[PDB]
Write an enzyme that holds these catalytic residues in place. Sequence first.
Site, PDB file in Angstrom:
ATOM      1  N   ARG A  54       0.842  -1.186   0.000  1.00  0.00           N
ATOM      2  CA  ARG A  54       0.000   0.000   0.000  1.00  0.00           C
ATOM      3  C   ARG A  54       0.881   1.240   0.000  1.00  0.00           C
ATOM      4  O   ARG A  54       1.606   1.493   0.955  1.00  0.00           O
ATOM      5  CB  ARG A  54      -0.944   0.003   1.212  1.00  0.00           C
ATOM      6  CG  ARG A  54      -2.041   1.068   1.154  1.00  0.00           C
ATOM      7  CD  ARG A  54      -3.030   0.949   2.313  1.00  0.00           C
ATOM      8  NE  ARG A  54      -3.816  -0.285   2.245  1.00  0.00           N
ATOM      9  CZ  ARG A  54      -3.889  -1.187   3.216  1.00  0.00           C
ATOM     10  NH1 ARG A  54      -3.246  -1.001   4.361  1.00  0.00           N
ATOM     11  NH2 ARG A  54      -4.628  -2.272   3.047  1.00  0.00           N
ATOM     12  N   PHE A  59       1.139  10.523   1.895  1.00  0.00           N
ATOM     13  CA  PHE A  59       0.737   9.938   3.173  1.00  0.00           C
ATOM     14  C   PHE A  59       1.820   8.990   3.705  1.00  0.00           C
ATOM     15  O   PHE A  59       2.586   9.348   4.607  1.00  0.00           O
ATOM     16  CB  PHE A  59      -0.607   9.211   2.997  1.00  0.00           C
ATOM     17  CG  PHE A  59      -1.213   8.651   4.279  1.00  0.00           C
ATOM     18  CD1 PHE A  59      -0.857   9.131   5.524  1.00  0.00           C
ATOM     19  CD2 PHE A  59      -2.143   7.629   4.208  1.00  0.00           C
ATOM     20  CE1 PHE A  59      -1.448   8.616   6.689  1.00  0.00           C
ATOM     21  CE2 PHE A  59      -2.716   7.081   5.362  1.00  0.00           C
ATOM     22  CZ  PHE A  59      -2.360   7.582   6.600  1.00  0.00           C
ATOM     23  N   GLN A  62       3.428   1.412   3.028  1.00  0.00           N
ATOM     24  CA  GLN A  62       3.228   0.322   3.982  1.00  0.00           C
ATOM     25  C   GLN A  62       3.703  -1.023   3.425  1.00  0.00           C
ATOM     26  O   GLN A  62       3.434  -1.358   2.274  1.00  0.00           O
ATOM     27  CB  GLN A  62       1.749   0.240   4.371  1.00  0.00           C
ATOM     28  CG  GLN A  62       1.406  -0.904   5.324  1.00  0.00           C
ATOM     29  CD  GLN A  62      -0.050  -0.869   5.728  1.00  0.00           C
ATOM     30  OE1 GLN A  62      -0.757   0.104   5.437  1.00  0.00           O
ATOM     31  NE2 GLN A  62      -0.508  -1.911   6.409  1.00  0.00           N
ATOM     32  N   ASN A 101      -1.160  -1.795  12.314  1.00  0.00           N
ATOM     33  CA  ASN A 101      -1.883  -2.707  13.203  1.00  0.00           C
ATOM     34  C   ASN A 101      -3.365  -2.775  12.871  1.00  0.00           C
ATOM     35  O   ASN A 101      -3.843  -2.070  11.978  1.00  0.00           O
ATOM     36  CB  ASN A 101      -1.678  -2.307  14.676  1.00  0.00           C
ATOM     37  CG  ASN A 101      -2.278  -0.960  15.022  1.00  0.00           C
ATOM     38  OD1 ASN A 101      -3.439  -0.686  14.732  1.00  0.00           O
ATOM     39  ND2 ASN A 101      -1.480  -0.109  15.651  1.00  0.00           N
ATOM     40  N   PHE A 112       4.892   1.071   8.464  1.00  0.00           N
ATOM     41  CA  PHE A 112       4.763   2.076   7.418  1.00  0.00           C
ATOM     42  C   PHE A 112       5.770   3.201   7.596  1.00  0.00           C
ATOM     43  O   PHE A 112       6.248   3.475   8.705  1.00  0.00           O
ATOM     44  CB  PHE A 112       3.324   2.628   7.334  1.00  0.00           C
ATOM     45  CG  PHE A 112       2.822   3.295   8.586  1.00  0.00           C
ATOM     46  CD1 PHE A 112       2.366   2.546   9.655  1.00  0.00           C
ATOM     47  CD2 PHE A 112       2.740   4.675   8.664  1.00  0.00           C
ATOM     48  CE1 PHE A 112       1.872   3.159  10.798  1.00  0.00           C
ATOM     49  CE2 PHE A 112       2.240   5.296   9.795  1.00  0.00           C
ATOM     50  CZ  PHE A 112       1.802   4.530  10.868  1.00  0.00           C
ATOM     51  N   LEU A 121      -2.581   9.641  13.807  1.00  0.00           N
ATOM     52  CA  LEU A 121      -2.142   8.283  14.133  1.00  0.00           C
ATOM     53  C   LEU A 121      -1.416   8.209  15.479  1.00  0.00           C
ATOM     54  O   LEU A 121      -1.123   7.109  15.969  1.00  0.00           O
ATOM     55  CB  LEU A 121      -1.242   7.734  13.023  1.00  0.00           C
ATOM     56  CG  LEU A 121      -1.889   7.728  11.636  1.00  0.00           C
ATOM     57  CD1 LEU A 121      -0.935   7.151  10.613  1.00  0.00           C
ATOM     58  CD2 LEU A 121      -3.199   6.944  11.644  1.00  0.00           C
ATOM     59  N   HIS A 125      -0.607   4.133  16.670  1.00  0.00           N
ATOM     60  CA  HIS A 125       0.473   3.354  16.074  1.00  0.00           C
ATOM     61  C   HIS A 125       1.775   3.677  16.786  1.00  0.00           C
ATOM     62  O   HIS A 125       2.051   4.839  17.069  1.00  0.00           O
ATOM     63  CB  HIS A 125       0.585   3.645  14.574  1.00  0.00           C
ATOM     64  CG  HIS A 125      -0.631   3.249  13.796  1.00  0.00           C
ATOM     65  ND1 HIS A 125      -0.740   2.036  13.156  1.00  0.00           N
ATOM     66  CD2 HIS A 125      -1.801   3.899  13.580  1.00  0.00           C
ATOM     67  CE1 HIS A 125      -1.922   1.956  12.568  1.00  0.00           C
ATOM     68  NE2 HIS A 125      -2.581   3.077  12.803  1.00  0.00           N
TER      69      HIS A 125
HETATM   70  C1  LIG Z   1      -6.094  -5.740   4.338  1.00  0.00           C
HETATM   71  O1  LIG Z   1      -6.301  -5.765   5.746  1.00  0.00           O
HETATM   72  C2  LIG Z   1      -7.381  -4.945   6.205  1.00  0.00           C
HETATM   73  C3  LIG Z   1      -7.050  -3.478   5.865  1.00  0.00           C
HETATM   74  C4  LIG Z   1      -8.278  -2.599   5.595  1.00  0.00           C
HETATM   75  C5  LIG Z   1      -7.930  -1.468   4.662  1.00  0.00           C
HETATM   76  C6  LIG Z   1      -7.355  -0.322   5.067  1.00  0.00           C
HETATM   77  C7  LIG Z   1      -7.006   0.815   4.193  1.00  0.00           C
HETATM   78  C8  LIG Z   1      -7.254   0.776   2.820  1.00  0.00           C
HETATM   79  C9  LIG Z   1      -6.919   1.854   1.999  1.00  0.00           C
HETATM   80  C10 LIG Z   1      -6.331   2.998   2.545  1.00  0.00           C
HETATM   81  C11 LIG Z   1      -6.061   3.068   3.921  1.00  0.00           C
HETATM   82  C12 LIG Z   1      -6.411   1.965   4.727  1.00  0.00           C
HETATM   83  C13 LIG Z   1      -5.420   4.305   4.537  1.00  0.00           C
HETATM   84  C14 LIG Z   1      -6.381   5.462   4.819  1.00  0.00           C
HETATM   85  O2  LIG Z   1      -4.795   3.950   5.801  1.00  0.00           O
HETATM   86  C15 LIG Z   1      -3.612   3.279   5.725  1.00  0.00           C
HETATM   87  O3  LIG Z   1      -3.063   2.960   4.688  1.00  0.00           O
HETATM   88  C16 LIG Z   1      -3.082   2.989   7.117  1.00  0.00           C
HETATM   89  C17 LIG Z   1      -1.837   3.848   7.367  1.00  0.00           C
HETATM   90  C18 LIG Z   1      -1.019   3.355   8.565  1.00  0.00           C
HETATM   91  C19 LIG Z   1      -0.706   1.870   8.407  1.00  0.00           C
HETATM   92  N1  LIG Z   1      -2.000   1.203   8.286  1.00  0.00           N
HETATM   93  N2  LIG Z   1      -2.737   1.556   7.127  1.00  0.00           N
HETATM   94  C20 LIG Z   1      -2.566   0.296   9.161  1.00  0.00           C
HETATM   95  O4  LIG Z   1      -1.977  -0.048  10.189  1.00  0.00           O
HETATM   96  C21 LIG Z   1      -3.957  -0.232   8.810  1.00  0.00           C
HETATM   97  C22 LIG Z   1      -4.987   0.617   9.580  1.00  0.00           C
HETATM   98  C23 LIG Z   1      -6.431   0.469   9.151  1.00  0.00           C
HETATM   99  C24 LIG Z   1      -7.088  -0.763   9.307  1.00  0.00           C
HETATM  100  C25 LIG Z   1      -8.419  -0.916   8.911  1.00  0.00           C
HETATM  101  C26 LIG Z   1      -9.118   0.159   8.370  1.00  0.00           C
HETATM  102  C27 LIG Z   1      -8.473   1.379   8.217  1.00  0.00           C
HETATM  103  O5  LIG Z   1      -9.143   2.440   7.687  1.00  0.00           O
HETATM  104  C28 LIG Z   1      -7.140   1.547   8.598  1.00  0.00           C
HETATM  105  N3  LIG Z   1      -4.060  -1.645   9.185  1.00  0.00           N
HETATM  106  C29 LIG Z   1      -3.789  -2.656   8.291  1.00  0.00           C
HETATM  107  O6  LIG Z   1      -3.443  -2.481   7.120  1.00  0.00           O
HETATM  108  C30 LIG Z   1      -3.990  -4.072   8.836  1.00  0.00           C
HETATM  109  C31 LIG Z   1      -2.717  -4.939   8.723  1.00  0.00           C
HETATM  110  C32 LIG Z   1      -1.603  -4.298   9.554  1.00  0.00           C
HETATM  111  C33 LIG Z   1      -2.921  -6.381   9.208  1.00  0.00           C
HETATM  112  N4  LIG Z   1      -5.160  -4.633   8.153  1.00  0.00           N
HETATM  113  C34 LIG Z   1      -6.467  -4.565   8.581  1.00  0.00           C
HETATM  114  O7  LIG Z   1      -6.698  -4.003   9.648  1.00  0.00           O
HETATM  115  C35 LIG Z   1      -7.578  -5.182   7.728  1.00  0.00           C
HETATM  116  C36 LIG Z   1      -7.662  -6.681   8.040  1.00  0.00           C
END
Ligand SMILES: CO[C@@H]1CC/C=C/c2cccc(c2)[C@@H](C)OC(=O)[C@@H]2CCCN(N2)C(=O)[C@H](Cc2cccc(O)c2)NC(=O)[C@H](C(C)C)NC(=O)[C@@H]1C
Length: 163
Positions: A54, A59, A62, A101, A112, A121, A125
């Site tokens: 990602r 931003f 990741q 997370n 990330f 955040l 985080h």
């Molecule tokens: C595939 O696995 C899904 C992910 C759901 C999709 C999230 C998503 C999609 C597009 C853009 C963004 C988030 C932007 C705005 O945010 C980030 O890139 C943030 C930035 C900080 C690092 N990060 N993603 C995170 O730490 C994210 C935080 C998060 C989770 C759920 C919803 C959400 O809006 C943000 N956690 C995840 O990616 C985790 C993995 C670490 C296991 N996956 C999950 O929790 C579930 C199982």
Amino acid sequence: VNPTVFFDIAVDGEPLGRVSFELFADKVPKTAENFRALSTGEKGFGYKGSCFHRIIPGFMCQGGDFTRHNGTGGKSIYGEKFEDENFILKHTGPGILSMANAGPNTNGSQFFICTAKTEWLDGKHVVFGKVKEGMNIVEAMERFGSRNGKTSKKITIADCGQL
Ligand SMILES: CO[C@@H]1CC/C=C/c2cccc(c2)[C@@H](C)OC(=O)[C@@H]2CCCN(N2)C(=O)[C@H](Cc2cccc(O)c2)NC(=O)[C@H](C(C)C)NC(=O)[C@@H]1C
């Protein structure tokens, strides 16, 4: 005494450049050690060969899913997941290295790299490092990202380790 680690980044299998990080072991030793060991591969698994799944320009970038390779996986050196160590350090600007997370106390291997201040955040985080060299490589990586984060080329950690 803070460790330094590096990623050699590739774009569709061709070299892009090296990103190096300082890990703030002095404030988050457990979190720093996890990233360090996953970078050397000394536990028999880790970041080598994994991708940045990602990338959102302006931003963050990741990566870190080396178990499922679909953005849901990865694991720590402590079994599976571990607790948020502390939230002393904040997402203050470009270069900050922080744990991805799925809510409180779900740290695995995913991480990330911020390319901007992301204060919303803070407290959610765990920040544990910063880019030391190669911020221009992180900026180059952003060209292959998109609004929703899907990458237009395969962005991989071709090699990694400790300096
Ligand atoms: C595939 O696995 C899904 C992910 C759901 C999709 C999230 C998503 C999609 C597009 C853009 C963004 C988030 C932007 C705005 O945010 C980030 O890139 C943030 C930035 C900080 C690092 N990060 N993603 C995170 O730490 C994210 C935080 C998060 C989770 C759920 C919803 C959400 O809006 C943000 N956690 C995840 O990616 C985790 C993995 C670490 C296991 N996956 C999950 O929790 C579930 C199982």
